[PDB]
Symmetry: D2
Subunit: 293 residues, 4 copies
């Protein structure tokens, strides 16, 4: 199994993509063992990015590695087609799309047309980015089997019965969970890994949870998963998408600038309370020789 | 109270706004009694539009009438501020914004900041576009009071208790329902009216229901409400957002072009089945002398 | 429209039904203008009551009035059949049942059979007690039409569209809402009335809201509705079903004993804290001359 | 890790517990590898049983094995307290209780008081029977810690992060999942086992899944889990609670009578169709030498 990072998109103070900070961040992650990079996902504020900005993220990360899954979805299908086509010249893993978001009660027939249309034009394997809470509809294993063209799926859902069902109906499909709290579980139950936003700021931990599991040292794995669980929670206190920046800078020692409002950055005091929550978990992890002093 | 139409956005074969069909459609809605027009709402596929297209829509409808509320929201706070300020030069009713959509678990603080910010730059009254199902969060009465600067609210929710609470905790606020099926109810329980996608294709009906409720002929108003509900129901089969195009062409007799994929247009078979579903209702509406044979 | 009280079941300290405190309560509710009494409802802890105890409450209230709808449902169908049958010796308004509760994902086919069985054996009209949050399923207008034998429905749901649908699909059916916070609206929109737990402790208020709406004195009907909403909100601090005992003694002046654990009574501190929250409301209610002294 | 059967309560034509069929079923289950027997659970129609019938089920199953967890809860605390005390004389594993069911929006204070009371009176370890979707409320890991006195939890939820959290915050607690579809996952991820309803009719399978996962043959374990998953799906076509009787008679060869209305038994045509849906599976299982022809 693998650990896939839905990479953060660092923005400048004046709301541009800081291509340099993106590259450092991508470089660090590859250095610390991350298998692939998922670009323009939720953790990267993909839905806040223009088609031009989505392409920029690909170009910036393509300098660092070609193990990229390139998210192109949106509510303008022509922008998504143009993006999928422009990836032809990029030797990457595949492209991805989440479902058309916002609009409730969208017909299965219409949703199927959308993903089929991305497959008919894609010059790479096509991954399904399933995130019902964010997009407001579910491409479950049955609908994915009927699309018939996905090479994998990132299932962002608390229900893991739902994630396993993809394998059951598509034995050949790569199945990833999007929950950080299930790295140990995923790795041990026969799935292909985790798209984990927590790997942005603790890639050492998510990678290590994985190893321990494949070594059938599940007891340890859970101990480590649970520490990771506390950090996940610390980030929700103030808004995990904004906390990702503070956490990555705190654990990995470089700046990722700011998010894109209405994803507002944490202020000086929110930053203090967040670090005061994880201060002790950091120490324990240097103790356990998982982080460098 | 008022009927406010969340006006459809017509698209050409080339996926561009059809300015002339928009103006044609806007005229008819004003001439058939609609009080104001909500531009770049859900029914208009607001989220699917660029900021330049959101402004395009305003410029084109202003040609016909200034009784407009201008929706400017999005996931780039800068683009919305720009849009909100550009409205200075239009003598319109207000601007509006849904809460920032897609991203879950957004802090109340971050959500209040997003709206207080728009209020801060706005040269017109600011209206709250509350659509919890489509956006993923609820700017309810307490939070709207906390925000402190809304002139009105459009509450897209089937819980009318939730809607009354706005009037209770904000006595001077205009409180509209976004539910086509409560036009009789809203009018009769002291609320300021409805924002009704259904008024796109049968503005004769939404207006008549409200009038009938004002004259306290509530029994006669429900009878027309339930006929309207059935049309609402029929449009859901193939996707209501697409079907309004068909229905508007069918009941009002001019064409509105295409929706923007992934909001796909009904096909010829789908268009024909919907009409067969509404022929019997149209008959009863002719019978009532609300429509011409 | 009508106000129907879901009458509390008074319990002694020994976990017995206090029949005399009950009769007193019924007498007062009737004397203050309540139209009918709903016995063994949620507010009278029906599901906590045995078949003998339900019948007991019917015998008890029948001593005071015959304007009684008699809930009989349960998870043992032979007990419900018996209660339905035994009601023949009582000249009441009808019987009623919620859907079988607790067990998730019950089949419409089986749910229809449950209710048709009660209709086949019922000596009186049958009322659908629809409470989806409590029973775990929904007997909407479509399933009620299919069942085909309901004289009326009590619809405990935040969604008034859902309630209107019973009228749309069942024009002859008596349609009540079970939402205290919608008494003015229900009355103003052509529905048949409310089943209002808050009429246990403030029947003066609930009846005046109804009357004001019937007179189309809408803003004054809302004024009183919004105070009532504040009492409802106060009751939720410590548990609404237990607070009803404290609130009814406070406003009506006679003590109703205790609820049945695990519906724990409020302790004396809690009782005093809840009364501190409603001293204000009560003061205004005296000023407005809806309550005495 | 263990498989615990939430044993079925078999009823006669006359709606009485068939003590003798329950003992055969009970003996069989233990003998095919079932670890513990959960009595009076959702699958046994717990909420449908009088307290006497809850004690009668214990006395019967106790004649076969002392590996019994004795669920005692209900909406009359005095009955529960007394069912707890009467278990003093049975040398069993422990008692359990779901949360008080039906009544929505109950206070965390009262829910804790409920479980603490049972702990105060219990002569055996107390198990939390957590079933959010049946009871209408959830006792999460956090609350179970507050309550403070649970030896084990049985988490009936399709969300396995929710289940793992009990072990996170309560390391000394036995944590079982209630989902038949996670037997392989639960066993390979370090949790303590499953409360599997489908082990009523295919105990061979649920125990072989478990064995396989313990043996790290995760691929062979999943293939068998996917078989079992289909049987679970087939059981829903008609009412899984009802279908379980048919399926046990089919797979195990002895009839368990009827369920209790309103849990209606399948009729003969429903029996036929259901068997046709699982005939193929019964063949695959005999092919794998898991079942004898």
């Amino acid at each position: 199994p693998e650990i896939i990072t839905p990479i953060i998109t660092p923005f400048t103070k004046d709301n541009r993509i800081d291509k340099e900070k993106l590259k450092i961040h991508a470089e660090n992650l590859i250095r610390k063992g991350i298998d692939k990079l998922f670009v323009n996902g939720t953790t990267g504020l993909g839905p806040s990015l223009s088609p031009e900005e989505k392409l920029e993220n690909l170009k910036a990360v393509y300098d660092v590695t070609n193990k990229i899954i390139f998210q192109v979805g949106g509510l303008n299908l022509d922008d998504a087609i143009r993006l999928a086509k422009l990836s032809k010249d990029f030797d990457i893993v595949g492209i991805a799309s989440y479902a058309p978001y916002y609009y409730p009660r969208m017909s299965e027939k219409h949703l199927v047309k959308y993903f089929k249309t991305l497959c008919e034009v894609s010059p790479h394997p096509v991954y399904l980015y399933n995130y019902p809470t964010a997009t407001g509809k579910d491409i479950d294993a049955k609908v994915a089997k009927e699309i018939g063209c996905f090479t994998g799926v990132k299932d962002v859902i608390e229900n893991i019965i739902h994630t396993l069902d993809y394998k059951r109906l598509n034995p050949n499909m790569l199945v990833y969970s999007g929950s950080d709290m299930l790295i140990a579980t995923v790795a041990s139950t026969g799935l292909d890994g985790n798209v984990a936003l927590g790997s942005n700021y603790l890639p050492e931990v998510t990678v290590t949870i994985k190893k321990l599991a494949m070594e059938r040292k599940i007891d340890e794995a859970l101990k480590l998963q649970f520490l990771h669980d506390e950090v996940i929670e610390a980030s929700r206190i103030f808004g995990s998408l904004s906390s990702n920046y503070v956490l990555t800078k705190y654990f990995q020692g470089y700046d990722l600038g700011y998010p894109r409002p209405p994803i507002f950055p944490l202020d000086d005091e929110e930053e203090r309370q967040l670090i005061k929550k994880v201060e002790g978990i950091r120490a324990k992890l240097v103790e356990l020789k998982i982080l460098k002093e």
